């Protein structure tokens, strides 16, 4: 019913639409037609589940430097 | 009154700040480490970005106070002004509590792990904010939508 | 020749320096702000520590050239020499058959993800130390001569006290896929 598009952010320093135009922002041509893209859906590729590649295997021991780092 | 809405937007500024720092929209050299609730966050020291985020949260805060908050969305737009990533924040209100600070940290870890998997964004991307609310016949958590690209 | 080991060793050098800063293994007075990959990092100005890190990675480098490394783990040990957290770098190198600043722009995200570790991990006990563990694909004793490139910097097999953690919590950090490099980075933290 209500969508509050807080249009802003710079670059390189039937439901009702409540757009937030902001001040002298008027320069990047047709702002509403641009915002029409941001409200639109898109085909989302579902999140990839995170799994480790090499789990902790108790058989394969790792390598270590003989020296311990200096302390304070 | 109900001060819970005063603290949600308070760390919502942190959440979007984290996304901006983490989604590498540009060289993040503007960021500085500042501590809130004894947890540090990289906040942008750019005055215009902070002003845009402050005006954003000041306009959204009463909507939180009136239980008129359904979703808060952060959309990343490529240089073609096409959305690539959407951070949706669904909120359901209850159908002192400052002692529970660990969940303020755990929320941050949920954003961190949700980002741990997404691909790298195209260069020159920008972003915008969306707020979805409703009060028709009804008859916090988040999830992310990523584009194919 | 094979140069991916050079960018990996420089990336691991800035990564371990930042890890020691973010996890407070050493006081902040020994760190200085530098710029790497267009990101502010905290580099150590300790001569013996810098020589220690460089000697370590200069010996690890030929194993990267040979692609004989599964994971490189930075382990922080408490005062009892028990691992409290582990920063695991899982590495996969696919076969090969063109510029490579794309890799630097890609590796930037891992450094940015290491910085938020101050916000996701509980503060470590005081007086912690660290070491680097290399899990090789081939059994480590086979290629022991490949790493003894510095005469006064010998390498040893780690033991269970330096490696084993009882049911640690898994903290995902970053995943990268590329035509030249596949890398994952996560944290194994103790239940405390």
Residue numbers in the entry:
A (entry chain X): 2 to 14, 33 to 91
B (entry chain B): 12 to 106, 115 to 158, 199 to 208
C (entry chain A): 12 to 108, 114 to 208
Copy out sentences from the published article reporting this entry, exactly as the authors wrote them.
To test whether REV7 can adopt a dimeric alignment in its complexes with SHLD peptides, we next designed a fusion protein containing an SHLD2 fragment (residues 1 to 19) fused through a Gly–Ser linker to an SHLD3 fragment (residues 1 to 58) and a C-terminal fragment of REV3 (residues 1887 to 1894) (labeled SHLD2.3). The structure of this SHLD2.3–Rev74 complex was solved at 3.8-Å resolution (X-ray statistics in SI Appendix) and is shown in two orientations. The crystallographic asymmetric unit contains one SHLD2.3–REV74 complex composed of a pair of REV7 conformational heterodimers connected by a pair of head-to-head aligned SHLD2.3–SHLD2.3 β-sheets. In each REV7 conformational heterodimer, one REV7 adopts an open (O-REV7) while the other exhibits a closed (C-REV7) conformation. The SHLD2.3 fusion protein serves as a strap with its N and C termini binding O-REV7 and C-REV7, respectively, therby strengthening the conformational heterodimerization of REV7. The 936 Å2 dimeric interface between O-REV7 and C-REV7 is further mediated by multiple intermolecular hydrophobic and hydrogen bonding interactions. Notably, Arg-124 of O-REV7 forms hydrogen bonds with Ala-135 of C-REV7, while Arg-124 of C-REV7 forms hydrogen bonds with Glu-35 of O-REV7, highlighting the importance of Arg-124, consistent with previous reports. The C-REV7 forms the typical safety-belt including an intact β8′/β8″ hairpin, identical to that observed in the SHLD3s–REV7 complex, while O-REV7 lacks both the safety belt and the β8′ strand. The β1 strand of SHLD2 is positioned between the β6 strand of O-REV7 (antiparallel alignment) and the β1 strand of SHLD3 (parallel alignment) as shown in Fig. 2 G and H, with this sandwiched β-sheet topology stabilized by hydrophobic and hydrogen bonding interactions. We anticipate that REV7 tetramerization reflects the short SHLD2(residues 1 to 19) segment used in the fused SHLD2.3 construct, which on replacement by the longer SHLD2L(residues 1 to 52) in the SHLD2L.3 construct would disrupt the tetramerization interface due to the presence of additional β2 and β3 segments of SHLD2.
Human Shieldin consists of four subunits, REV7 (also known as MAD2L2 or MAD2B, 211 residues), SHLD1 (205 residues), SHLD2 (835 residues), and SHLD3 (250 residues). As the first identified member of the Shieldin complex, REV7 is composed entirely of a HORMA domain, acting as an interaction module in a broad array of cellular pathways. The Shieldin complex acts as the key downstream effector of 53BP1; it not only binds and shields single-stranded DNA ends but also mediates CST- and Polα-dependent fill-ins of DNA breaks. TRIP13 forms a hexamer to drive the REV7-mediated disassembly of Shieldin in an adenosine triphosphate (ATP)-dependent manner, thereby releasing the DSB DNA ends for resection to promote HDR.
